[PDB]
C-alpha cells in the first residue's frame, strides 16, 4: 500500500542520487576540456595572427625584389646591345687599321725607292757636270777664236790673204813668176837666171864675164 | 496526510526522471561537440606549425636572394661603368685613325708628285746630256787646238811669224822688196826688170842684146 | 517510523531540485562556451587556409626568381668576360695607332726631305744647262772647224803647205834662195845683187854702166 510507494519512491530516490553524481562528475570533465580548449583558441588565434603579419612582410620583400630584378634585367638588355655594337665597332676600326698599315707599308716602300732613285740621279748630274766642265774648260783655253794678218776668221772658216807675187799651187802657197824675166822655181827654190857665156856670179852678185868683148877686142 | 505528501514525492519524482534524461542527452550531445572541437583543435596546431616552418623557409630564401641579388646590382653597376668608358676609348681612337688617315691621303699625294717631278727631271737630265755630248764631241773633232810653224796659237789668237823678205801690204802676205835692185811686183806677181835695150830674156835667161854694136 | 522515510525522502528531494537547476546552469553555460568555440574554430580554418594559399604563392614566386636570378647572373658573367675582351682589343689597338703614328712622323719628314733636295738639283740642273748651252753655243759661233788652201786642218791641228822657194828660219815664214843666183835677203828684204862698177838701177830696170865699153 502505502508502505509500498514510499519503498518505490526510495528506490528512484537513490537512483537519481547516484545520476545526478554522474552527471556532475561529466559536467566538470566538460567544463576543464572547455577551458584546455579555450587556451588552445589563444594560442592559435596569437599565433595565426603573428603568421598572417610575417606573410604580408614577405609579400612586401619579394615583390620590392622582383621590381630590382626587372631592373637589372632591362639594365642587362641594354649592356648587352651595348657591348654588341662595341664589337662590330672595334671590329671594324680594326678591318680600317689593317688597311691603313697596308698603303703606309707601301709608302715606305715608294719613299726608299725615290730615296735611292734620287741619290742615283743626283751623282750622274754631278758625274756630267764634272766632265763636260773639263771638255768645255779645254775647248775654251785652246780653240783658235782669233787671228791676225794675213789670216781671218768669218763663219768658223780660215783664210789666208795673198797679195800679187804669192798664189797658191796646188795645196800651197807658191812664189808667182809672171812671164819670163829670169826668174824660175828650181834646184829647191826662187833662182836668178842668165846667159853663162856673157854672165857669172862673183860674191853673189851679178857679173859680166871676162871673155865678153874678146870677138870686139879681136 | 501521507498520501498527499506521497502524492507530491512522487509527482516530483516523476518531473526530476524526465529532467535527468534530458540532462543526460544535453551532456551526451556537449561532450561530442567537445570531442569534434579537439580534432579540429589537433588539426590546427599541425597545420600552423606546418605554415610558421614553410614561412621561417621562405624568410631564409627571401634573405639569401637579397644578397644574390645585391651583388648582382654592383656588378651590372661595374659593367656599366667599363662600357661607357669602351665606347668613349673606341670614339677616340676613331678620330684619331681618322685624322692620321687624312695625314697618309696627304703623304700619298705628295709621293704620286715627287715620282712625276724626278720622272721629269731624268727625261731632262738625259736630253741635256745626249745635246752637249754631241756638241762637244763635234767641236772635239773639228775645232782647231794646235799649229804647225809658221802659224803659232797664244790665247786663242792665231798669228803667222815671218821672216824678212816677206811682210804685209794691208791685211796680205807681200813679198818685200827694200830699194830698187830691179825687182818689181807686176804683170801679177813677181818679176825681174831690165833696159830694153842693153838686155832680152832668152829661154828665161838674162842675155845681152844682140843689137849692141 | 513511515513517516520519518517520508521527511527522509523529502529532504533529498529539495537537494535533487536545487542541484538539477545548478546542473542546468552548468550544462547552458558549456553550452554557450562550445557555440563560441565552434565559431573560433570556423575562423580559424578560414584564417590558417588563407595563410597556407599565402604560402604557396609566395614559395612560387621566390622558385620563379630565383630562375631568373640565376640566368641574370649567368648574362652578367657571359657580358664580364666579352667586356675583358674589348677593353684587350682596344689596348691592342691603341698600341698598333700609335706605332703607326710614329711610322707616318718620320714618313713625313722623308717626304719634306725628299721635296727640298728634288728642288735643290732641279735648279742645279737648270744652272748648268744655261751655263753650258752658253758656253757650248759661244765655241760653236767663234772656234776655227775650216780652212782654205794653203791652211789645211787634220786631227784638230793647223798647217801649212809650202811650194819650193817658200821655207821657215825658226818658226817664221822665209823665201828659199838656193845657190848664189844674184839674189839675197838683206835689207830687210829680197833683192838683186849685181858688180856696181858694171851695172847699175835706173828706174828700178838693170842697166849697163856707160863705162863698160870705153
Redesign the interface.
Known amino acids: 500500500g502505502?508502505?509500498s510507494?514510499?519503498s518505490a519512491?526510495?528506490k528512484?530516490?537513490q537512483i537519481?542520487?547516484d545520476?545526478?553524481l554522474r552527471?556532475?562528475q561529466?559536467?566538470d570533465d566538460?567544463?576543464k576540456?572547455?577551458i584546455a580548449?579555450?587556451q588552445?583558441?589563444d594560442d592559435?588565434?596569437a599565433?595565426?595572427s603573428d603568421?598572417?603579419l610575417?606573410?604580408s612582410r614577405?609579400?612586401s620583400?619579394?615583390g620590392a625584389?622582383?621590381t630590382?630584378?626587372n631592373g637589372?634585367?632591362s639594365?642587362?638588355t641594354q649592356?648587352?646591345a651595348?657591348?654588341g655594337q662595341?664589337?662590330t665597332?672595334?671590329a671594324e676600326?680594326?678591318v680600317?687599321?689593317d688597311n691603313?698599315?697596308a698603303?703606309?707599308d707601301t709608302?715606305?716602300r715608294?719613299?726608299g725607292s725615290?730615296?735611292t732613285?734620287?741619290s742615283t740621279?743626283?751623282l750622274?748630274?754631278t758625274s756630267?757636270?764634272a766632265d763636260?766642265e773639263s771638255?768645255?774648260s779645254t775647248?775654251?783655253?785652246?780653240?783658235?777664236?782669233?787671228?791676225?794678218?794675213?789670216?781671218?776668221?768669218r763663219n768658223?772658216?780660215?783664210?789666208?790673204?795673198?797679195?800679187?807675187?804669192?798664189?797658191?799651187?796646188?795645196?800651197?802657197?807658191?812664189?808667182?813668176?809672171?812671164?819670163?824675166?829670169?826668174?824660175?822655181?828650181?834646184?829647191?827654190?826662187?833662182?836668178?837666171?842668165?846667159?853663162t857665156d856673157?854672165?857669172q856670179?862673183?860674191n853673189?852678185?851679178?857679173?859680166?864675164k871676162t871673155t865678153?868683148f874678146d870677138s870686139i877686142n879681136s
Open positions: 502505502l508502505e510507494r514510499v519512491l526510495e528512484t530516490s537519481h542520487s545520476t545526478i552527471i556532475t561529466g559536467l566538460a567544463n576540456r572547455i580548449l579555450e588552445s583558441r592559435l588565434v599565433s595565426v603568421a598572417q610575417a606573410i614577405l609579400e620583400s619579394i625584389l622582383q630590382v630584378v637589372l634585367d639594365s642587362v649592356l648587352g651595348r657591348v662595341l664589337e665597332g672595334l676600326l680594326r680600317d687599321h691603313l698599315v698603303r703606309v709608302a715606305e715608294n719613299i725615290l730615296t732613285e734620287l740621279l743626283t750622274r748630274v756630267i757636270q763636260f771638255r768645255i775647248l775654251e783655253r785652246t780653240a783658235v777664236t782669233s787671228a791676225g794678218a794675213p789670216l781671218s776668221i768658223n772658216r780660215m783664210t789666208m790673204g795673198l797679195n800679187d807675187g804669192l798664189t797658191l799651187s796646188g795645196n800651197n802657197l807658191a812664189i808667182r813668176l809672171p812671164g819670163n824675166t829670169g826668174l824660175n822655181i828650181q834646184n829647191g827654190g826662187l833662182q836668178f837666171r842668165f846667159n856673157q854672165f856670179i862673183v853673189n852678185n851679178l857679173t859680166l865678153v
